[PDB]
Amino acid sequence: LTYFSARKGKRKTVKAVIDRFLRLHCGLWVRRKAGYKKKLWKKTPARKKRLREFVFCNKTQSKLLDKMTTSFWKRRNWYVDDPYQKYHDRTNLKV
Amino acid sequence: PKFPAVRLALQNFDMTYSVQFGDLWPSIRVSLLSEQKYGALVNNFAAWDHVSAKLEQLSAKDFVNEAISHWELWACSPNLRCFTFDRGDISRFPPARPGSLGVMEYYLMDAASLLPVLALGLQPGDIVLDLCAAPGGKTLALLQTGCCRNLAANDLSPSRIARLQKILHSYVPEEIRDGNQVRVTSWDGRKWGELEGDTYDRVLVDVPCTTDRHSLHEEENNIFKRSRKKERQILPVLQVQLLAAGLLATKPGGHVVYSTCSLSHLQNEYVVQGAIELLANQYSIQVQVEDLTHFRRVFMDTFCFFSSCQVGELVIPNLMANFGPMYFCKMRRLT
Amino acid sequence: ANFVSWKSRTKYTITPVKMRKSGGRDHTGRIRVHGIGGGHKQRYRMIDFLRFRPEETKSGPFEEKVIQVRYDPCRSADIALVAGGSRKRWIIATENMQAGDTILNSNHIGRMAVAAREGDAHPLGALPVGTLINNVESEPGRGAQYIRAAGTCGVLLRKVNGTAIIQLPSKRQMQVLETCVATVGRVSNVDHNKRVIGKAGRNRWLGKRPNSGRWHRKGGWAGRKIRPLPPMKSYVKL
Amino acid sequence: LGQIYANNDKLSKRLKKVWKPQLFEREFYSEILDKKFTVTVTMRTLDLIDEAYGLDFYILKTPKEDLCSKFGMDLKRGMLLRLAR
RNA sequence: CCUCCGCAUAAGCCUGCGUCAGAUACACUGAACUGACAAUUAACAGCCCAAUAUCUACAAUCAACCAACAAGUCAUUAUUACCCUCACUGUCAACCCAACACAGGCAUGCUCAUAAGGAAAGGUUAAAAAAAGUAAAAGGAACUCGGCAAAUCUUACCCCGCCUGUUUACCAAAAACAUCACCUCUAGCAUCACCAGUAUUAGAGGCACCGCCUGCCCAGUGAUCACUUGUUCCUUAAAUAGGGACCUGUAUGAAUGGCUCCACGAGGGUUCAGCUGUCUCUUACUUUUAACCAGUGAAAUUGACCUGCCCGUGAAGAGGCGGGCAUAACACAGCAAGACGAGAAGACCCUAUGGAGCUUUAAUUUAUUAAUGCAAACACCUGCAUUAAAAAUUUCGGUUGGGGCGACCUCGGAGCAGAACCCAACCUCCGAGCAGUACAUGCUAAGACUUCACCAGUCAAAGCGAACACUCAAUUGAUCCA
RNA sequence: GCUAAACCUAGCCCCAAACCCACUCCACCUUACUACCAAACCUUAGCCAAACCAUUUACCCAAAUAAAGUAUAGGCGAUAGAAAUUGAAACCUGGCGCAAUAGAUAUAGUACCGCAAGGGAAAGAUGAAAAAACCAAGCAUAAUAUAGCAAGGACUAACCCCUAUACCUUCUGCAUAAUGAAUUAACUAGAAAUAACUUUGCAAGGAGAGCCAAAGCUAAGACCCCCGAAACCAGACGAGCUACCUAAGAACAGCUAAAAGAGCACACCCGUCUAUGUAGCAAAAUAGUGGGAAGAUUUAUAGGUAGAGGCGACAAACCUA
Ligand SMILES: C[S@@+](CC[C@H](N)C(=O)[O-])C[C@H]1O[C@@H](n2cnc3c(N)ncnc32)[C@H](O)[C@@H]1O
Ligand SMILES: [Mg+2]
Ligand SMILES: [Mg+2]
Ligand SMILES: [Mg+2]
Ligand SMILES: [Mg+2]
Ligand SMILES: [Mg+2]
Ligand SMILES: [Mg+2]
Ligand SMILES: [Mg+2]
Ligand SMILES: [Mg+2]
Ligand SMILES: [Mg+2]
Ligand SMILES: [Mg+2]
Ligand SMILES: [Mg+2]
Ligand SMILES: [Mg+2]
Ligand SMILES: [Mg+2]
Ligand SMILES: [Mg+2]
Ligand SMILES: [Mg+2]
Ligand SMILES: [Mg+2]
Ligand SMILES: [Mg+2]
Ligand SMILES: [Mg+2]
Ligand SMILES: [Mg+2]
Ligand SMILES: [Mg+2]
Ligand SMILES: [Mg+2]
Ligand SMILES: [Mg+2]
Ligand SMILES: [Mg+2]
Ligand SMILES: [Mg+2]
Ligand SMILES: [Mg+2]
Ligand SMILES: [Mg+2]
Ligand SMILES: [Mg+2]
Ligand SMILES: [Mg+2]
Ligand SMILES: [Mg+2]
Ligand SMILES: [Mg+2]
Ligand SMILES: [Mg+2]
Ligand SMILES: [Mg+2]
Ligand SMILES: [Mg+2]
Ligand SMILES: [Mg+2]
Ligand SMILES: [Mg+2]
Ligand SMILES: [Mg+2]
Ligand SMILES: [Mg+2]
Ligand SMILES: [Mg+2]
Ligand SMILES: [Mg+2]
Ligand SMILES: [Mg+2]
Ligand SMILES: [Mg+2]
Ligand SMILES: [Mg+2]
Ligand SMILES: [Mg+2]
Ligand SMILES: [Mg+2]
């Protein structure tokens, strides 16, 4: 990535990550399963259900995605009707 | 490919078949390179009466029906119907469809391929062996007769035997393919003698050949490939083993047919002669070759024959009747 | 570059003119033509290719006397100095032209075809069909350009309507107006083609530099392969 | 003077391209100057003349940035001086 | 005693061995070093010219015979205009281009051995090895890859290339290139090449003198001519097969192949005769070098060294490690067995998602050029499209001695971890790239497994809705994009 | 005690401010520095990044900040990237800059090198007045005595005795293998973020507008080297060597020859073979022997052809070793 811009001298976001991932404020990243739109005719209903899921990422994956995005993408957003609003905060988490 | 495999076949055939056939070779050569004439073998499990009428509308004639009429001017395998066009007609049959019962009406295959099946004088309640059944055609025709009490299908390659399963399912109902009624195996045919001896009334042996028609056209998995040159050299040896193996399995008084797709007298006549010699010495079993002069005479109308074979009958391709080469030799185990 | 053509003379003269060799180079200074350079020094003799050029304050057919017939370095053909009135000029000599010969130049087209003597220059209209001709003009009063090499003769094939078909020495027919003037007969120095150079040194004297030592595959290209035909190439014998 | 993509696709090769106007020698009459001029024009300027209702109107109305001709400016000066004097 | 040099001009350089006075790559306290002073004097050479028209066919070679070919190195006139003179500059040298006072490079005239110009030896001794010479008994190529070198001055061939000529400046002079002659292809023409040319010409090429052989896809028989045939039309639904027209102004074929042959060659091979220290088998002498004395005084190289031998060890290989042995310390001259002796430059194999040159039937292009068509405009130009030529940019996956012909790269099974899991590279074998039956092969959801990561992949309680989460070992493909 | 060592100040660096230069006379675009005669405007490409490469890959444009690395763009990859909107305070003569290997290359664009464009140095130190001590390497004073990584344990005693396989770096691991070092002095190589941690301030708020915040926010501290290709492109400079050509020149003794790209053979041109030489006389020479020597010959002068190119009797030859 661009650590320092030529114009502003600022860290840049990788726009690929924004197109593919959602960041929850708590630090988790959400993604679609790969190949969920692909060749559904030859796939079992159980497998199709597994594919049609929003899944969280590894610690290592999360750390990668954090570095590849600026602080703007990590801010608390109060969207008017956000389907992922409840998932922004963690409850009853011990260590 | 840097050098086509089909070119090797042409080079190989020209040097050997020219001397074998003389002035006949040009006629055979042009026919081999030209488009193969096909016969429609009607599925008996389907509506045989309706299909026969339909194919008659396309100006196709059942040659075997005509053959049966002129037979009595042993008996051939019954319940076989194959429609072919008249001499000099290039007409193609329409692609086959599924029927009302859910089985396909007819099977498009080489008409000459039925001759080995017809040569084998199938009788009701006969235990029959096919050492090299895959991909099908011949073994399908065995089932069409309905004279097979127990049929065994064998082939070394499970890839090709898988194709047979598809053909059997499409054409033959599950009722007919009951337990031990039709047996399908993927084992070596050479070791069949020690597996079971004096089991089968009739054995059809269709050894691997150079596949003259197929080798000239299809590049993929060609026998004339330099990688497969070692296979070609050991092929005459391998052919004898299989024919011998079939003879062991046959009960005394039983009949076998040896079918080969090649023009080569090396893979036709010498294999038959060699198998008899091998069996007579090693196992002390006598084989009597049954004459097919009457058989060749009956089928002169549809198929042209090369009248110079010491043993068996060779069907040569003609541009009038472009039927693929077929060498069938019928012989009986005396002991 | 600094190249200036030697062809600067504006006034015709019979005096041999000093000429500069090119070497096959341009004004730019780069080679355009290979195999030219450094023969024997030559002097240019200006040739009047317009045979029917009437003198100043004169018109109509005129006669000239051949003073001498002379070798020319610049061309294959021999040249003749010819005098008429108070004018001397260089012309291209015919096959049989001698000193003392008298030659006529006319612009008169005859209703009855005039007898064609070898030395004389006439309009093609005047000349009979089948006469060997030389020094022809494409356009009336343009000047001779076409048959001027040694031992070369054109044939007046036919004359239609104010037009004439001539055969150039390459056996190619050319349409020419009847008013155009040609010189009768064959050009001098016949059997020029029969000359033998004999040694490499002679061509060097003539100003011809030796051919490149590079080996070329073929003068003509290879036939381009069409889409279905490629399998039919590169057959290997076994 | 610009660049183009080979077959109007950015994935193909980028090439230098020059678009040139079509040029015509045409005769024009100035009634202010009472003179005929042979000038190299395009179809655009002919259409501009037509809409301005004559060469004189075209020259006088059109500013310097639109004319883009030194000769046009000289014509303009000529006509303005004629009108002034 | 040498002179293969000299003197001058040109070119180049620019005061660079004249005088005086000083300090001081052999040296003179003298040098060409430092400072000051002086000097090359034009007749030689350079530096030229009023205008406008106009004139100038006939070489040179003792220029006379004779003979040419490659065709040549020097000429004015008419009219107008015209009266002031000897200015300016080079002129030196022991000299220039080669980093140097360099065995090299350097045009011309005269001298063709000097009338001009120079000195091979610092002094000594007379070792080895090294270099150049001279002489050699008897033998005469026995030497050697080879008569290389030397001596002697030689024959007859073979191969290659006709020949003279040219080529890798600095490892190849040749059989390579060119070359007369021959052959093929292209072109019907002017004012900047070709060319002030024109088809007996010009350009692009091939082959290599000459000389001798090698030449038909021109329609077949029968007696220039009839007739099917070939080609085109029409009839025929359309054809089969019938009706009509033409093939009768001419054609040659090979940038084809072989064959001797004269001359020639620093070409490659063989050979006769002689000859010679090449050799048997080496020796003597001279010069250089050498060593010593005097002066001046480098370079590669160098971890530090107080730097031995034998055997062993270190996969070979030890001055230095182990066991033995040896051993006062220092020069000088030889030597090349070791110090994987020293300096570059190699040759071989492999590697790099490192380069570059060349080729093409690699991919991507047609910006350029040429032609064509369609617009515009009333042939050129412009825009668009198409076709070619010419290029341009970029690349050349992995395994398998290395090379050719092959094979292989993903998934499943066995040898194969004897018993949780995992794990046997390479190899030896097999198979897979489907298919069949449903059509709730609907929806949703606890908990789990996981091919050692991730991505993927797998099982499933309960519930909603139905009914009374298929078989098969694999039977498969992310993102983008459409 | 020699060679040496030592020094402080010429000057320079970054800013700030301020808008610079420009005739004694004479000469100077022709061969510049020579008194005096008939024609400019015209897309940069490429390296490089994408771990190849082919679309693509930041580069000033009218002045801070913030919006914002946001909208957007993009083999939607690498990466590129706005605007609406907000808002800007003005004191030159200073330095936690260098001090002769530093700071300018500079004592000077000089000497020197190169045909040219072009490259490009080194160095000085007395005192108010010159009209006045010791220390690097290398050596010398003062060569050496069995034996061995040069020392250590020691010892009365330098050595003798006993113990001890130089240093660095590389290879999957190993050194003893290989790499690098004559020695001395000077010079010569870890630059920054998100996120975390530590220490303060304030605290459901923090921050000297923007931004963040379900104990956070603000501030500080604390992590990211040096040298080296063959290349590619753009713009200049080169044909005084050489390849070829153009203009106008010059040279070729003697002897045999019906007389010549003839023969022998000088000068001249070339370079077959051997020997010498190999930091040489020489970055290609010398001696002998050779090939040619009236010609497709050799050679002096001036001019021309220029790198996506020239030129070539093709050797991938030559185009300033
Ligand atoms: C020429 S094909 C038979 C043609 C087939 N019957 C037909 O008509 O379509 C021969 C077959 O025999 C098989 N085969 C070869 N060797 C065999 C063996 N040893 N035992 C059994 N089958 C064998 C081949 O794999 C091949 O499928
Ligand atoms: Mg000429
Ligand atoms: Mg050639
Ligand atoms: Mg002096
Ligand atoms: Mg004078
Ligand atoms: Mg003297
Ligand atoms: Mg001396
Ligand atoms: Mg001496
Ligand atoms: Mg000696
Ligand atoms: Mg002797
Ligand atoms: Mg011998
Ligand atoms: Mg002898
Ligand atoms: Mg010997
Ligand atoms: Mg010799
Ligand atoms: Mg002697
Ligand atoms: Mg020759
Ligand atoms: Mg010669
Ligand atoms: Mg020669
Ligand atoms: Mg040479
Ligand atoms: Mg050489
Ligand atoms: Mg040589
Ligand atoms: Mg040749
Ligand atoms: Mg030679
Ligand atoms: Mg010595
Ligand atoms: Mg000495
Ligand atoms: Mg040194
Ligand atoms: Mg040892
Ligand atoms: Mg030891
Ligand atoms: Mg010694
Ligand atoms: Mg050592
Ligand atoms: Mg690369
Ligand atoms: Mg590259
Ligand atoms: Mg796992
Ligand atoms: Mg594994
Ligand atoms: Mg359930
Ligand atoms: Mg890259
Ligand atoms: Mg400095
Ligand atoms: Mg400096
Ligand atoms: Mg010291
Ligand atoms: Mg010791
Ligand atoms: Mg070293
Ligand atoms: Mg020049
Ligand atoms: Mg020159
Ligand atoms: Mg000339
Ligand atoms: Mg002479």
Ligand SMILES: [Mg+2]
């Ligand atoms: Mg000669």
Ligand SMILES: [Mg+2]
């Ligand atoms: Mg000679």
Ligand SMILES: [Mg+2]
């Ligand atoms: Mg040459």
Ligand SMILES: [Mg+2]
């Ligand atoms: Mg070559």
Ligand SMILES: [Mg+2]
């Ligand atoms: Mg080569």
Ligand SMILES: [Mg+2]
């Ligand atoms: Mg150079």
